[PDB]
Symmetry: D2
Subunit: 319 residues, 4 copies
């Protein structure tokens, strides 16, 4: 139980049961990836990507890593780079919450921002450019097979072990790099063919099911393209989810269950409740909670939330 | 295995070894309490007080809990209340950060603001008042024995079990409600008398060493009084730490080890290091890391932290 | 944390590294299934079979479970029966140790014996008669998909999780029901196709290699037929092991590493060492340790072990 | 995660709830020490005694450990030495179970038999002589502070952690070296002063009550002398248990709960049930289960076994 490195605490996250949000004749369990030291499921690929690189001789002590940090991946790489002795450089838009900025500089990352109006790929480009220019290492979160690999061996094993001999009918997840859905899905389809793998997409960005994509707010989900690490054959059910319904459900999870997660976590739970609403008696669902809601205080997850005293509420108590 | 409630994940936090921040002739271990669902050590006292009130029959379903808080205690109580189905009311000054407000509200907590300058003792009167006026339950983080009690049964147990049959010389911690220092200290006193219980406090608030308190920046540490839940006899070495040193140490922990923790965590690691410097060869130290640094962005933890790219360093060669 | 039933402790067994028995340029790990409450890997299929039957509505507390056994399955089933409120009847050949009899009885199980030479084929036939005659539930460990299924979900997950991000090159295991080999093997294929599935059989019972069988002494291994649960496609290297090398390797493990396991475990460890001897630097192997050697005392495992004092040694 | 050595799996044993043996108005939990690699709670003192000697410099590579044992201490010390690479020498009566010897032999331990009668302090001095004569290490289980220490740091910690924020009214345990009673009791007294520590003694061996000893059949308990490691200030209730009632409770535990433990385990559970019968509603008890019942196959725990075939029973 004594741990050598903080990176040894990655994975083995808890799966907990929702106490009141689910229909009584149903059971909805949830996987909290905020328990990872990085506060998100990205701790998995970041650690896997780097360990795979080292064993491949692509990374050496003191080396430098660079990637296009949309948010969590940057924080996880920064943490892993810091913990293993690497330098980390991430490229994020000029217009990106100053918090997602301070977080990276916290782990000692050297940040370089470009005009946000460059549609993301601008950094994704200056990533490989600055990479070969100095022989820097690129994670390639979207194409590095170590990503779905770590999920096959850890995430899936954790889910499989927890539900062994027990009932499980639905596994719900959204996708960004698609590593989670791919890895867990491949393991599930073989081990539990009966479990329906449910993949959700933001209502406006139904890339997979309609080739359409529009800037959404369900952070960490549906990027402007389809990752090559994806194995869509694993998907049993492809659905959509409104960013507002997802934001609202994330808020409910917090106030009604005490589980403070982000938007994509609200989306998965929303989809689960949806299926549960009309599901047969005794249906068991599992939803993925990708990260902590703590890094969302400055996003639409907190839009319309009172900041002052609850005078009105106090007043309603004496009348 | 599956967990029934999110509250069943509280505690059993990891103790990790610092990989490079400590003198090669020493081993410095760190207990990362940010792994608690609530992000801080307070998850323990929050759970303990509620489970305790329920057993004594002081908390029935749908009841509401009130507490004058400003930091992690309010977040923890709110989370626990949200998970147990209780209503929670946080009484805090308006001078306190807004982010702190959003956290308590995220968990469905009710906010009751009051003039900051009024100070703790002021808001405590407010909480006491509401509590009586409406018959709500008061946590009393500074006097509730269930607070240190839970550290004796969990925190201490985790430390003892991880170090069983292994060397351990110093256990370093600061104190707010002192629940951690008192509880773990009482168990170590019986199990490992050789371990020095090092209790640190802010220099400009060496409230115990020299009975002097004054606004410091090590959030969570040394209140302006002496908690009734404390047992001073447990302390072996009473020292002081500087907020700037604590702050820097914290920035190092994050950048050099990959462990992003609060300022009070920087303080303990700092004292642990100071002891490590001029210490026997092979000595082993354990320092408490109270919370996650993620809720310290609007703090002097990021005084002059670059908020924009540094294309200056971008060309060196 | 607290456990509700003893059955909730099944699985999640430890994998330990051999300290001195393996070639220095190599790493041999071992999965100790004796940590299961029932003392062997059989606790996995016994729990899984019963839980599946319950879900299917085929088993109801108070019902009677019957199964042909070589020893371990009987103990496991008997233990689970005692834990869930079921009656258990074991069909075993007299050939097996009376200490395997007391163990099944200790859990309150009932014992029905038949001529040892009939083998698993004969007992299965007997278990079946009794099943029809009394409406008893048949576990059918060689055909019940719940057997390999539980290994995919647990054993495999434990192995995959333990080695995530680490080097693993070989996985060695013998087979009886073939649940472990099939379950772990099929999941190894999906997650780590490179790893080589090494499947051993007793030299005198190469039912797969040469379709031959003959009463052997590596308990738990090679029945007189090919289990229907089996999926041969999972095996990369099919090898043989002599019972004496097995027996002696199990002794070495106990005396040189502090790990006291059975004979089949001696076999898998021997096979792993052999491979490791001529394997490239850094090769990592994992051997399955089916059970505790504590139930092999009155067995050839303790053939001629000095039951008397070695005053001679004291002479010096 | 992967374990470096087999010794790294010592401790952290599960606490499980009895399903049908306890009065419904009550809850009886049980700590199963048989989950230790060595099969008993002695794994804790054995490891602790060695790491302490090593740190103190009293043990160096190749050094040899000797101790007079016929029970679990020998087995535990035997395994530890085998994993640590020390030599182990056991001193026991030649009239003892040929299996108890086999166990020590399995772990590569040397055997020096001696007159059964002179058992007690005799075989001990024979080890005492060998100790100074050859410069060998003596554990001193009954007086070594490291025994209770390890219990205060692991056993007690596992109990306190599992019951944190939950009800716990009674802790029941017997004593041999008294290391468990002392260790768990000292930590219990500090964190949970209201939990009543119940120490039982065999009916004919009430050493603490009136200093009277007599040979009994509850293996592991009541030596013929009050151990120096004992702390009487932690005992709330001193009770006695009849060895037959213990033996029978052990049988019940296995057959009714699926938990196979030794005689002393039957004894503690017997005491817990007794306390539970007339205890207020909601009372929670925890009882220590010292070892596996698997090494009691040649003891009275198995008298009237009926090792044949349940042909008679089959008739109906
Ligand atoms: C990475 C991420 C996801 C999607 O997970 P993948 O494994 O990349 O499919 C969902 N939500 C958030 C907040 C993320 O960071
Ligand atoms: C509560 C707290 C402490 C002090 O812990 P106590 O157990 O109350 O003494 C230290 N740091 C932070 C950030 C805290 O929230
Ligand atoms: C059951 C058993 C095996 C073989 O395992 P399967 O999963 O049934 O193939 C090997 N050794 C022993 C001692 C066994 O009991
Ligand atoms: C050692 C032992 C005990 C008594 O435990 P102590 O901690 O030595 O007091 C009880 N039962 C058995 C079977 C034992 O081996």
């Amino acid at each position: 139980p004594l741990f050598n490195s903080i990176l040894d605490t990655i994975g083995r996250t808890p799966i907990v049961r929702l106490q009141r949000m689910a229909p009584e004749h149903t059971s909805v369990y949830v996987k909290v990836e905020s328990f990872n030291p990085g506060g998100s499921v990205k701790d998995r690929l970041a650690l896997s990507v780097v360990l795979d690189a080292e064993a491949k001789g692509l990374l050496k002590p003191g080396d430098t890593i660079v990637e296009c940090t949309s948010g969590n991946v940057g924080i996880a790489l920064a943490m892993v780079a810091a913990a293993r002795g690497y330098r980390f450089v991430a490229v994020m838009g000029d217009t990106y919450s100053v918090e997602r900025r301070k977080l990276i500089r916290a782990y000692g990352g050297k940040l370089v921002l470009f005009p946000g109006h460059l549609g993301s790929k601008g950094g994704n480009l200056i990533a490989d450019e600055l990479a070969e220019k100095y022989g820097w290492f690129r994670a390639r979160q979207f194409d590095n097979p170590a990503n779905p690999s770590y999920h096959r061996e850890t995430t899936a094993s954790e889910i499989l072990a927890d539900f062994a001999g027990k009932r499980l009918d639905h596994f719900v997840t959204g996708f960004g790099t698609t590593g989670t859905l791919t890895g867990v899905g491949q393991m599930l389809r073989v081990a539990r063919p009966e479990v329906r793998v449910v993949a959700l997409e933001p209502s406006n960005a139904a890339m997979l099911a309609r080739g359409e994509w529009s800037p959404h707010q369900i952070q960490g989900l549906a990027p402007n393209f389809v990752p090559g690490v994806l194995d869509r054959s694993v998907i049993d059910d492809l659905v959509t989810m409104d960013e507002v319904t997802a934001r609202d459900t994330s808020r409910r999870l917090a106030a009604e269950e005490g589980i403070f997660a982000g938007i994509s976590a609200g989306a998965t739970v929303a989809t689960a409740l949806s299926i549960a609403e009309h599901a047969p008696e005794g249906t068991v669902l599992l939803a993925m909670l990708p990260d902590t809601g703590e890094r969302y205080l400055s996003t639409f997850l907190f839009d319309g939330v009172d900041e002052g005293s609850d005078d009105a509420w106090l007043a309603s108590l004496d009348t």
